[PDB]
mmCIF file of C-alpha atoms and ligand atoms in Angstrom:
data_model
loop_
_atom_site.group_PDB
_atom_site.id
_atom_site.type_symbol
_atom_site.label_atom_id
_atom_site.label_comp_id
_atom_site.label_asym_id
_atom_site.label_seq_id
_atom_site.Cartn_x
_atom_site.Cartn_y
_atom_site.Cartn_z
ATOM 1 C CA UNK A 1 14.629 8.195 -10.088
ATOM 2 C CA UNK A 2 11.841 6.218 -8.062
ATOM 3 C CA UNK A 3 12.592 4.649 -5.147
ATOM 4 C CA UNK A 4 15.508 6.339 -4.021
ATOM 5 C CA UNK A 5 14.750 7.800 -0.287
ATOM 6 C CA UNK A 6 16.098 11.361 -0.351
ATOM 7 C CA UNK A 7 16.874 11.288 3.591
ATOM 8 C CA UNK A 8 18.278 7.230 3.130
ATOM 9 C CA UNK A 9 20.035 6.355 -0.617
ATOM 10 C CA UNK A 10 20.671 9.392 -1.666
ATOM 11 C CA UNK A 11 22.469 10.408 1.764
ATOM 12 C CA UNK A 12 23.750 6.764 2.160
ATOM 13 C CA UNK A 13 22.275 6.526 5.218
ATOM 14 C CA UNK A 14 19.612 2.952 6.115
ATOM 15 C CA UNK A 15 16.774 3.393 8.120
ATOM 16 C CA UNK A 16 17.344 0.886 10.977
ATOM 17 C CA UNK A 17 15.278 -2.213 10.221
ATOM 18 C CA UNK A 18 16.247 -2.470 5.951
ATOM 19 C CA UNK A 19 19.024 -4.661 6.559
ATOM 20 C CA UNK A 20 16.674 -7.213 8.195
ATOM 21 C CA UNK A 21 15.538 -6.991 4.658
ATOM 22 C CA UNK A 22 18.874 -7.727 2.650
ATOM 23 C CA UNK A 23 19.306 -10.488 5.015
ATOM 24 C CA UNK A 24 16.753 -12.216 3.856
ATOM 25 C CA UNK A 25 17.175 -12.166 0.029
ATOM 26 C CA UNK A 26 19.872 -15.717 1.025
ATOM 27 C CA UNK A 30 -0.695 -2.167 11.373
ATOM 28 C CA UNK A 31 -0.255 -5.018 14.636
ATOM 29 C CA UNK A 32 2.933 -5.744 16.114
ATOM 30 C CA UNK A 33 4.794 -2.690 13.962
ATOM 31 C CA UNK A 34 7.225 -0.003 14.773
ATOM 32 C CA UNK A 35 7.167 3.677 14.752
ATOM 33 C CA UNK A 36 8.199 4.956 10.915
ATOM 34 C CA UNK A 37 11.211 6.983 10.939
ATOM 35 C CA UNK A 38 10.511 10.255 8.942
ATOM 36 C CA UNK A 39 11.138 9.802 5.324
ATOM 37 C CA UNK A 40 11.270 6.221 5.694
ATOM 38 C CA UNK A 41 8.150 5.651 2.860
ATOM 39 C CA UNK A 42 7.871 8.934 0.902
ATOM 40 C CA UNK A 43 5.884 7.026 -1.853
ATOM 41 C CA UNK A 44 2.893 6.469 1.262
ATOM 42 C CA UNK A 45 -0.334 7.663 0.509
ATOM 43 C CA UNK A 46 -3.166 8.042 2.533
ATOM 44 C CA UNK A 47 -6.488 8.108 1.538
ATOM 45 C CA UNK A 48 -8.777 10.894 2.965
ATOM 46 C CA UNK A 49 -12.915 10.974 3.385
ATOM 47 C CA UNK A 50 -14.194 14.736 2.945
ATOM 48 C CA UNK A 51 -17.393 13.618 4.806
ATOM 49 C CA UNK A 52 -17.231 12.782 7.710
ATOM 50 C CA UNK A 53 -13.252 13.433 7.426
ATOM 51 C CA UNK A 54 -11.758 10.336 8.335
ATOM 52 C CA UNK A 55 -8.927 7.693 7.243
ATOM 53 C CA UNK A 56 -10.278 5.648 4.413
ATOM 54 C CA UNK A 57 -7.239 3.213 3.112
ATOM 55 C CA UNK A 58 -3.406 3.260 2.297
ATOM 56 C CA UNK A 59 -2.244 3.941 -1.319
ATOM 57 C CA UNK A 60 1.513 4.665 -2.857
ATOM 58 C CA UNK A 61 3.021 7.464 -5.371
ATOM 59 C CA UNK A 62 3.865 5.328 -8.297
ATOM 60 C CA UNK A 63 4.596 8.881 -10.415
ATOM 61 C CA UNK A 64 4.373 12.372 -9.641
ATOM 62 C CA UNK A 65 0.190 12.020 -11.115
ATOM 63 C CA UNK A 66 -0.470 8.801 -10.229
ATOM 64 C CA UNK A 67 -1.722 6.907 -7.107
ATOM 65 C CA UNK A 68 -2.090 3.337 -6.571
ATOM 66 C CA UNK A 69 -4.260 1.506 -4.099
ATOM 67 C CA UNK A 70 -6.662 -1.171 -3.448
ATOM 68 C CA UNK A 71 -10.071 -1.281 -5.801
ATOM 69 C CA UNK A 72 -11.757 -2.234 -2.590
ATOM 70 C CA UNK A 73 -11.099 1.228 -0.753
ATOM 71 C CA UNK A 74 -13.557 2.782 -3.389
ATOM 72 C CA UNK A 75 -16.139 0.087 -4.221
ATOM 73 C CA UNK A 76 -17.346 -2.717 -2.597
ATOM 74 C CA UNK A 77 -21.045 -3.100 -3.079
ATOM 75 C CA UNK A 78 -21.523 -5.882 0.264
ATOM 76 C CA UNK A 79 -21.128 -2.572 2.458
ATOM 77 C CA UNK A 80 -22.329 -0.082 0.118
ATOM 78 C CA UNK A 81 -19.371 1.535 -0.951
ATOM 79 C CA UNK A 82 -19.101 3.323 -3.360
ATOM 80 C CA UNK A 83 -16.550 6.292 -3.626
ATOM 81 C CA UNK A 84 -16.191 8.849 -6.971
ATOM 82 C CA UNK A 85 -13.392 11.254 -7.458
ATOM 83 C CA UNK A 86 -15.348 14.335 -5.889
ATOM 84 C CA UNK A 87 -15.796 12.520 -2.310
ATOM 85 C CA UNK A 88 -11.929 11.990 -1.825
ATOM 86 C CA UNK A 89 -8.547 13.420 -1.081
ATOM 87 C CA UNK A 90 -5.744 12.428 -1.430
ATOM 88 C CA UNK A 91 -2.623 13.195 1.392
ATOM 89 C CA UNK A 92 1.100 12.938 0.195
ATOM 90 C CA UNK A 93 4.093 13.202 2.494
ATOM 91 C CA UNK A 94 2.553 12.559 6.182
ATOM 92 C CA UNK A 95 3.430 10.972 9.029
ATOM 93 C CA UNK A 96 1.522 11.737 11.603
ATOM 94 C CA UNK A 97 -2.125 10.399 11.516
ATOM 95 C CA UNK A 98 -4.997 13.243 12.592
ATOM 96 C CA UNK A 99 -2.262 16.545 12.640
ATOM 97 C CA UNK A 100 -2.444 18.513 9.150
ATOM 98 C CA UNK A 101 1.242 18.405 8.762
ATOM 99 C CA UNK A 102 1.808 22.367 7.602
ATOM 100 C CA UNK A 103 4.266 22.989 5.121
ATOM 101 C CA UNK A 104 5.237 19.157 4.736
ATOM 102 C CA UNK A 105 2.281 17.266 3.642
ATOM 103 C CA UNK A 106 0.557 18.298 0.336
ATOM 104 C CA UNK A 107 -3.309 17.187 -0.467
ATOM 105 C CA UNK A 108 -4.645 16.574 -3.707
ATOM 106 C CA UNK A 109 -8.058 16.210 -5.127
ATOM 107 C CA UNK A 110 -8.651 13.602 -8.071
ATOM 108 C CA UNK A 111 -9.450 14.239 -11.458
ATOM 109 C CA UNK A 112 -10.233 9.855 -12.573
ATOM 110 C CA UNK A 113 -10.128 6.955 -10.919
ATOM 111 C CA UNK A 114 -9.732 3.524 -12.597
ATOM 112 C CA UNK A 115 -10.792 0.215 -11.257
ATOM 113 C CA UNK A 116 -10.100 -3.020 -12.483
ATOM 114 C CA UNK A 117 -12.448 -3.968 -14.947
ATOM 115 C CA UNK A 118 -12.534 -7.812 -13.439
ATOM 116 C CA UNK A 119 -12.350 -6.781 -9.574
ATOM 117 C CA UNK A 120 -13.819 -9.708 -7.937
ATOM 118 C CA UNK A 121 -15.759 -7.936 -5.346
ATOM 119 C CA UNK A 122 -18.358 -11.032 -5.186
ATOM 120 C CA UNK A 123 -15.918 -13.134 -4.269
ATOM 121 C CA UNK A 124 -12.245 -13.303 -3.231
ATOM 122 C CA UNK A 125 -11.434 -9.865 -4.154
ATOM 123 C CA UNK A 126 -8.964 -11.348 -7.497
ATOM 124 C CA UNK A 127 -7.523 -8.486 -9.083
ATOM 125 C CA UNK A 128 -8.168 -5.638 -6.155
ATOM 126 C CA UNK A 129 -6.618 -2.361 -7.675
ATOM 127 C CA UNK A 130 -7.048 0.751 -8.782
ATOM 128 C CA UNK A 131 -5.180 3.786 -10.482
ATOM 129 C CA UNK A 132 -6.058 7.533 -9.477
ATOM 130 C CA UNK A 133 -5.189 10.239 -11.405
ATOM 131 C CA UNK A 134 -4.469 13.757 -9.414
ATOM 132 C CA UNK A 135 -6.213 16.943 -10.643
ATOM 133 C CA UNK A 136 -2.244 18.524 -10.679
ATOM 134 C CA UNK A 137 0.998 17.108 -10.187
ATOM 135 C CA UNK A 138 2.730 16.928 -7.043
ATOM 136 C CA UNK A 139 6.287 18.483 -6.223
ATOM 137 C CA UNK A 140 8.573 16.290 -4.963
ATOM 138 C CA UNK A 141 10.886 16.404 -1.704
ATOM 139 C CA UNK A 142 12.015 15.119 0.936
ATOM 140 C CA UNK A 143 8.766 13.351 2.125
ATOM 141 C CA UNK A 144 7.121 12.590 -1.018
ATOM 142 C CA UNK A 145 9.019 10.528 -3.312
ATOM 143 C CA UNK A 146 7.154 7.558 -5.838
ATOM 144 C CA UNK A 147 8.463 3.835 -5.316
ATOM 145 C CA UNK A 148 9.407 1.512 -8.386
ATOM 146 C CA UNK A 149 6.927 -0.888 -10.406
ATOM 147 C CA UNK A 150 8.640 -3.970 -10.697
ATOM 148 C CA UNK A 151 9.498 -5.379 -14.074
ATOM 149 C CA UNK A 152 9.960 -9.407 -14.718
ATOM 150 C CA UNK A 153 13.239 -9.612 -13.963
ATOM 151 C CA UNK A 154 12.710 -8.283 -10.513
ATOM 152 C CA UNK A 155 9.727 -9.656 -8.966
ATOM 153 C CA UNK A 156 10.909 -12.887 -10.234
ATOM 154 C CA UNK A 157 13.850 -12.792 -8.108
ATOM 155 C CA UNK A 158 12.285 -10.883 -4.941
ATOM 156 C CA UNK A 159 9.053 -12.342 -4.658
ATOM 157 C CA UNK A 160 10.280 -16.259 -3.429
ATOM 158 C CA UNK A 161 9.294 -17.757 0.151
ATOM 159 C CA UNK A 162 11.284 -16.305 3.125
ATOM 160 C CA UNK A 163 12.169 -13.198 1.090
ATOM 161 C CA UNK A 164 10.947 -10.170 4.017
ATOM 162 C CA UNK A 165 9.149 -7.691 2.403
ATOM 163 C CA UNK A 166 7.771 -4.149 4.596
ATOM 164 C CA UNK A 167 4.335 -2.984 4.872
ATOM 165 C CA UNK A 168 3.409 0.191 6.134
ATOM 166 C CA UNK A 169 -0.332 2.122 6.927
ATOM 167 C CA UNK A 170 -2.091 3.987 9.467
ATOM 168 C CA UNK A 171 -4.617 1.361 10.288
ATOM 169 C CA UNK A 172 -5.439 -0.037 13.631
ATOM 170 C CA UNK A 173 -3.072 -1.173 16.102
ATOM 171 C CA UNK A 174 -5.259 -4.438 16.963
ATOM 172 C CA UNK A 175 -8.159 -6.447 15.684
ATOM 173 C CA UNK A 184 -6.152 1.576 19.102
ATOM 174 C CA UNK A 185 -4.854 3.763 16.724
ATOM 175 C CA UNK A 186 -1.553 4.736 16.132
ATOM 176 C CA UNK A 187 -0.304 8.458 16.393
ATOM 177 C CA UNK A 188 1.918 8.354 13.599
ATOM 178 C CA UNK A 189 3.020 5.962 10.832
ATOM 179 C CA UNK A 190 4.031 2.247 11.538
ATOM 180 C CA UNK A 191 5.867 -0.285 10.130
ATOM 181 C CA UNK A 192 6.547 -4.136 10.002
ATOM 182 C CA UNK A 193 8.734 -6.566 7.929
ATOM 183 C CA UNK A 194 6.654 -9.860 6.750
ATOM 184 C CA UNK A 195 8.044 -12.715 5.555
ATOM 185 C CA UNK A 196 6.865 -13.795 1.839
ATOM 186 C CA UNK A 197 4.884 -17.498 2.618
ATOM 187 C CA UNK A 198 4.744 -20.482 0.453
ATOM 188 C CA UNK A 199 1.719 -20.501 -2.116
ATOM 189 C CA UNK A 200 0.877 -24.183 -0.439
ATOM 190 C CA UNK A 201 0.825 -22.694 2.632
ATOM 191 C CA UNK A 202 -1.604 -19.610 1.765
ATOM 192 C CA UNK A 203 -4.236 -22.111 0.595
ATOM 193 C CA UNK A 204 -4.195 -24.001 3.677
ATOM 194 C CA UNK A 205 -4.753 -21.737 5.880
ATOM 195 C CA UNK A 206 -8.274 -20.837 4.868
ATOM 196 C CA UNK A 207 -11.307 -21.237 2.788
ATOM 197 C CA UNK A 208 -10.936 -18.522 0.222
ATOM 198 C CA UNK A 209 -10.203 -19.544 -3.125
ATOM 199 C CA UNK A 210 -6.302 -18.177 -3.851
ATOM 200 C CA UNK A 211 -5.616 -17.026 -7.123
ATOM 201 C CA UNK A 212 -2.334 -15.930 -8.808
ATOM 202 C CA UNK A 213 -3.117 -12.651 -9.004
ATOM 203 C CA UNK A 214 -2.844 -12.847 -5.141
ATOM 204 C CA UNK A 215 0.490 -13.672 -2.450
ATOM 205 C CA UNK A 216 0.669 -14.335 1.235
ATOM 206 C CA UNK A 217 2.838 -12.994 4.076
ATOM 207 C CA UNK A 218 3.051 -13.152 7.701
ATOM 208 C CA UNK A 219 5.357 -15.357 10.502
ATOM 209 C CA UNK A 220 3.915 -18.816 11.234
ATOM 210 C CA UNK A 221 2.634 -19.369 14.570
ATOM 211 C CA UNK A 222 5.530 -21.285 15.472
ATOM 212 C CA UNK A 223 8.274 -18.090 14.342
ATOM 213 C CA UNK A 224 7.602 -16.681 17.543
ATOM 214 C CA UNK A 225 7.271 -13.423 15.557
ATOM 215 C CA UNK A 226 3.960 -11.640 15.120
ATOM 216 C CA UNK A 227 3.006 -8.788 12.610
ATOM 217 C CA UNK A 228 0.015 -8.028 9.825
ATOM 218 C CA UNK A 229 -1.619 -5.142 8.606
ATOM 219 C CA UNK A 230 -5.225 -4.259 9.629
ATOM 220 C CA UNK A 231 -8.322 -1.660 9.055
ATOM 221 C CA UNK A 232 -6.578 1.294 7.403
ATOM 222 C CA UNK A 233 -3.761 0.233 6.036
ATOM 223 C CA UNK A 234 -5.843 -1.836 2.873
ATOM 224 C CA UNK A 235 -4.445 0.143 -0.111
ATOM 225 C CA UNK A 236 -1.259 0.515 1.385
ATOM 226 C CA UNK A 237 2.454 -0.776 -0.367
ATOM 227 C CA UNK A 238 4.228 -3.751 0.089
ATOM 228 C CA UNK A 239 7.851 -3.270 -1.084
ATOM 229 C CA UNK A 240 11.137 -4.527 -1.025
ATOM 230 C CA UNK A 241 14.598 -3.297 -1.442
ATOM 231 C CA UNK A 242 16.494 -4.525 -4.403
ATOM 232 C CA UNK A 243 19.871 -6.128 -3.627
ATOM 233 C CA UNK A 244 20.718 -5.355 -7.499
ATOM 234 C CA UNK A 245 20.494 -1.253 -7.938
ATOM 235 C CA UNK A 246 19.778 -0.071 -4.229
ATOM 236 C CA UNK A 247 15.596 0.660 -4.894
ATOM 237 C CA UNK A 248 12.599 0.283 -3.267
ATOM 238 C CA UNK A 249 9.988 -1.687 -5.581
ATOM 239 C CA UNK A 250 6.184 -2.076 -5.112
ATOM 240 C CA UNK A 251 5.368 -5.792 -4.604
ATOM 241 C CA UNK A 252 1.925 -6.555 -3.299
ATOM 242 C CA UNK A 253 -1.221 -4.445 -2.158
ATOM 243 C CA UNK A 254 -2.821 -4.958 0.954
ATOM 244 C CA UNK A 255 -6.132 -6.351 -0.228
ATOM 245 C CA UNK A 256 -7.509 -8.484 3.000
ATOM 246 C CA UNK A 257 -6.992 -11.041 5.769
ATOM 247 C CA UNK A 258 -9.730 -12.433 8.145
ATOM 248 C CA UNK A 259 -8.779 -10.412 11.329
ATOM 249 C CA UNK A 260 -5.765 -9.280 11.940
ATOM 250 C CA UNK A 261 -2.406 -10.954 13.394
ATOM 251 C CA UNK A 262 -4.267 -14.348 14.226
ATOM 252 C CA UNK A 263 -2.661 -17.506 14.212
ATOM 253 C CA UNK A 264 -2.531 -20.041 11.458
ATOM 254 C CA UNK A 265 -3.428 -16.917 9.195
ATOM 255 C CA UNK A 266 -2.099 -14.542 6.740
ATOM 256 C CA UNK A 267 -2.243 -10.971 4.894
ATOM 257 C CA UNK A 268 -3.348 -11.440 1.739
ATOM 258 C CA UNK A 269 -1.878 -9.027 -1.539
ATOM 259 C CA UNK A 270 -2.426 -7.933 -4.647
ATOM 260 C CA UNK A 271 0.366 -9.419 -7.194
ATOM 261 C CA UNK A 272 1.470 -5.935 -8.542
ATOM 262 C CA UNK A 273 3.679 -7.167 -11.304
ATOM 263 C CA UNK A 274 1.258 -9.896 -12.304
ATOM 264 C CA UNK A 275 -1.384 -6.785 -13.009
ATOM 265 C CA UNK A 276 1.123 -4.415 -14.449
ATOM 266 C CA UNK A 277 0.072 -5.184 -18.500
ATOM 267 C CA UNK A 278 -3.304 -3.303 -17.061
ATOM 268 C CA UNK A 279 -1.357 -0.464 -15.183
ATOM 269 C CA UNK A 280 0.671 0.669 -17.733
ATOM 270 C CA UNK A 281 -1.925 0.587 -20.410
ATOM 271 C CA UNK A 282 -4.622 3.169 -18.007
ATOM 272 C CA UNK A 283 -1.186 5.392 -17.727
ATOM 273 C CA UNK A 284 -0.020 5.463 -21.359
ATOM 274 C CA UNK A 285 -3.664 6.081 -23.119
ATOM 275 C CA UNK A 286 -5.360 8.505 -19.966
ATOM 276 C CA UNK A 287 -2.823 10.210 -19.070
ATOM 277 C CA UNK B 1 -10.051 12.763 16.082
ATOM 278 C CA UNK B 2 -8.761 14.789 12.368
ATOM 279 C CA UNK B 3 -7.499 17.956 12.599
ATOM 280 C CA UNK B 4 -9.262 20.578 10.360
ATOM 281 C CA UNK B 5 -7.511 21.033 6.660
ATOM 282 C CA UNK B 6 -7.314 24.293 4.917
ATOM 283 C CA UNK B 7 -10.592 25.109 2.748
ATOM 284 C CA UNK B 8 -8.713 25.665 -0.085
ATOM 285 C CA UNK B 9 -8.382 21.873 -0.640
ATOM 286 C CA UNK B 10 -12.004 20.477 0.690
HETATM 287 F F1 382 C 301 -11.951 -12.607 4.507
HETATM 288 C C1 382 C 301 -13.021 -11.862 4.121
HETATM 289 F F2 382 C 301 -14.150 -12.554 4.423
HETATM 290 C C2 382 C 301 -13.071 -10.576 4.956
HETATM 291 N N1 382 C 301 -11.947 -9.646 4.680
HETATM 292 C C3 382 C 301 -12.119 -8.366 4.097
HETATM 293 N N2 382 C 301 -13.289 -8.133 3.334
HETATM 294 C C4 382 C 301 -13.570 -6.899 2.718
HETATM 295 C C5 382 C 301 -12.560 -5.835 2.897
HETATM 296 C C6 382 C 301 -11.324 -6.061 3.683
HETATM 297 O O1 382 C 301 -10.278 -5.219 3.931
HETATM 298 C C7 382 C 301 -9.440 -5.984 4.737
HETATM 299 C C8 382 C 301 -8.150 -5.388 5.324
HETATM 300 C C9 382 C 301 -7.103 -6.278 6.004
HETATM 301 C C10 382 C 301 -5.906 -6.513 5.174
HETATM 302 C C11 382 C 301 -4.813 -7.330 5.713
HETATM 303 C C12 382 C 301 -4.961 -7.856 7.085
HETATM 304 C C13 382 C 301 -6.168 -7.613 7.904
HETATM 305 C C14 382 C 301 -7.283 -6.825 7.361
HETATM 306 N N3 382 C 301 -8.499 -6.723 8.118
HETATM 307 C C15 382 C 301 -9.073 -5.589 8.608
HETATM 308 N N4 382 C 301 -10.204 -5.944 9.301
HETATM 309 C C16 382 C 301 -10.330 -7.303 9.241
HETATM 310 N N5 382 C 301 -9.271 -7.780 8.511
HETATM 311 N N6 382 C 301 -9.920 -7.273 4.953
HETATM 312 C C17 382 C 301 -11.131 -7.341 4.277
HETATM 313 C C18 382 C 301 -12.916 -11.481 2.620
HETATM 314 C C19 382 C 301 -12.186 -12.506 1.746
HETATM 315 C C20 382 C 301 -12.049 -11.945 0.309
HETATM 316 C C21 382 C 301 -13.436 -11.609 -0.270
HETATM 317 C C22 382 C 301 -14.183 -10.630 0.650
HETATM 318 N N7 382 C 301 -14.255 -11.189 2.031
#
């Protein structure tokens, strides 16, 4: 059933930027989110102070995904467990406490990669959350797809426009509800070129090149958050990439760096079929 | 700039 939109697929109705999406299968610079445009968003909630920590996606009705990097990263002290965070399903506006549409949960484990590279390049930056109870779905809160081979081996090629979606700043200033951008998928070459950061191939690029005229990248806040793209085969959204990290944001010769979700799925499903 | 959530939850 995941990655069906209940007000999109399964009313045959598109939200109004997907086929930019389909046509290429041959947050800065973003748009407002129409509402039940990413049901499977996540955001990730400080108790104390309360505040917007990272992005993170519905993957099943117990189980979160986001970036390892959101809960530890010993160069700035962080260091999150399960009783410091919440977890905030169905939103779309930022700071309101959507009544009667959003539902919060509190964690009961979280699971980071044992070989995060947080000394280095951030290789391998995820991590699975388990909720405390499961979460009713509806019209807002619906999980996206994993990919399987078959899939991401088709989808994930240079050109292909994948969407990215977060509450995080608006520039290198924050946005009053969700946004939204579609990034191009860039060449591996490309990626490596454009900065000093060992690339691994647990990781992908996106963004326009300074030359598309286009601009668009994700930012603080929206780390965590899905990259996904529409299949052309059976009509669903699929989980792609992670934001992980970028230096700055929107800039020139540069590019959004992501977590290869299929590449890392041999450790996902194993956490989901022996913890839960 | 968040506004308050029920207790129930924190
Ligand atoms: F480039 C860096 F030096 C700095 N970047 C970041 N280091 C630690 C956490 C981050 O989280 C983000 C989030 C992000 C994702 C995609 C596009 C822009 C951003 N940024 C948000 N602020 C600055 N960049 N970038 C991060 C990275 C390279 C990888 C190893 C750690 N240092």
């Amino acid at each position: 059933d995941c990655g069906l939109r209940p007000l999109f697929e399964k009313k045959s109705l598109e939200d109004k930027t997907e086929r930019e999406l389909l046509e290429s299968y041959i947050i800065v610079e973003g748009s407002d989110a129409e509402i039940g445009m990413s049901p499977w968003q996540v955001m990730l909630f400080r108790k104390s102070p309360q505040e917007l920590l990272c992005g993170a996606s519905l993957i099943s009705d117990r189980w979160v995904l986001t970036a390892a990097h959101c809960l530890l990263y010993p160069p700035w002290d962080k260091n999150f467990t399960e009783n410091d965070l919440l977890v905030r399903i169905g939103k779309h506006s930022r700071t309101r406490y959507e009544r009667n549409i959003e539902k919060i949960s509190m964690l009961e484990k979280i699971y980071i990669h044992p070989r995060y590279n947080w000394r280095e390049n951030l290789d391998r930056d995820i991590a699975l959350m388990k909720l405390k109870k499961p979460v009713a779905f509806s019209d807002y809160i619906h999980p996206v797809c994993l990919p399987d081979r078959e899939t991401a081996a088709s989808l994930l090629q240079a050109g292909y426009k994948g969407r990215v979606t977060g509450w995080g700043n608006l520039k290198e200033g924050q946005p009053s509800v969700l946004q939204v951008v579609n990034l191009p998928i860039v060449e591996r070459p490309v990626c490596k070129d454009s900065t000093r950061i060992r690339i691994t191939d647990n990781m992908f690029c996106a963004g326009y090149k300074p030359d598309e005229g286009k601009r668009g990248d994700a930012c603080e806040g929206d780390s965590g958050g899905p990259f996904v793209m529409k299949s052309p085969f059976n009509n669903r959204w699929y989980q792609m990439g992670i934001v992980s990290w970028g230096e700055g944001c929107d800039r020139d010769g540069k590019y959004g760096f992501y977590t290869h979700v299929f590449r890392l799925k041999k450790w996902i499903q194993k956490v989901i079929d022996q913890f839960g | 700039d968040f506004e308050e959530i029920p207790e129930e939850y924190l």
